[PDB]
Amino acid sequence: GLSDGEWQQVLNVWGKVEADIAGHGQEVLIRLFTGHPETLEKFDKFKHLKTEAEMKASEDLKKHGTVVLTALGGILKKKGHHEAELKPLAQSHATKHKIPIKYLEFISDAIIHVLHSKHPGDFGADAQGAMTKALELFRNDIAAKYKELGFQG
Numbered sequence: 163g164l165s166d167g168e169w170q171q172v173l174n175v176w177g178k179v180e181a182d183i184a185g186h187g188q189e190v191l192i193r194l195f196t197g198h199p200e201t202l203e204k205f206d207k208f209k210h211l212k213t214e215a216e217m218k219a220s221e222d223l224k225k226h227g228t229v230v231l232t233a234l235g236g237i238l239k240k241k242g243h244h245e246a247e248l249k250p251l252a253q254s255h256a257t258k259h260k261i262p263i264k265y266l267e268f269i270s271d272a273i274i275h276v277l278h279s280k281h282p283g284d285f286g287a288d289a290q291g292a293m294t295k296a297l298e299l300f301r302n303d304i305a306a307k308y309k310e311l312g313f314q315g
């Protein structure tokens with residue numbers, strides 16, 4: 163799905179998330195939780211967070227934000243050759259956590275907003291282009307393993 167010009171544009175932008183990995187996932191997650199309250203109920207450790215301040219105050223959210231981007235960060239450094247790190251997440255999020263594919267759509271959009279907000283001006287038409295594609299290739303590979311186990315379709 164993507165070339166190196168494009169991969170190279172994805173990793174430069176990732177370069178940005180890594181200087182503040184915990185600030186970028188707290189915000190990503192906040193943005194998911196307030197945008198789609200429904201997703202917050204899946205978590206028995208953050209279901210208690212009614213407000214956005216109880217959320218931003220939360221030291222447990224930021225520790226969960228890190229895991230999220232550390233695990234995502236690693237798939238993308240693979241440049242679509244993620245068959246290995248991905249199998250386990252698809253199979254965890256599907257049989258165990260039972261998260262439908264569109265919640266993965268919510269997070270992706272969520273990531274792309276967050277990148278705008280925090281870098282208001284240094285994430286362009288092309289980077290934005292290439293970051294969408296990779297998050298798309300990502301969802302698609304999972305959809306493919308989500309279809310094998312027959313989790314909703």
Ligand SMILES: [C-]#N
Nearest residue numbers: 191226229230
């Ligand atoms: C996982 N979030």
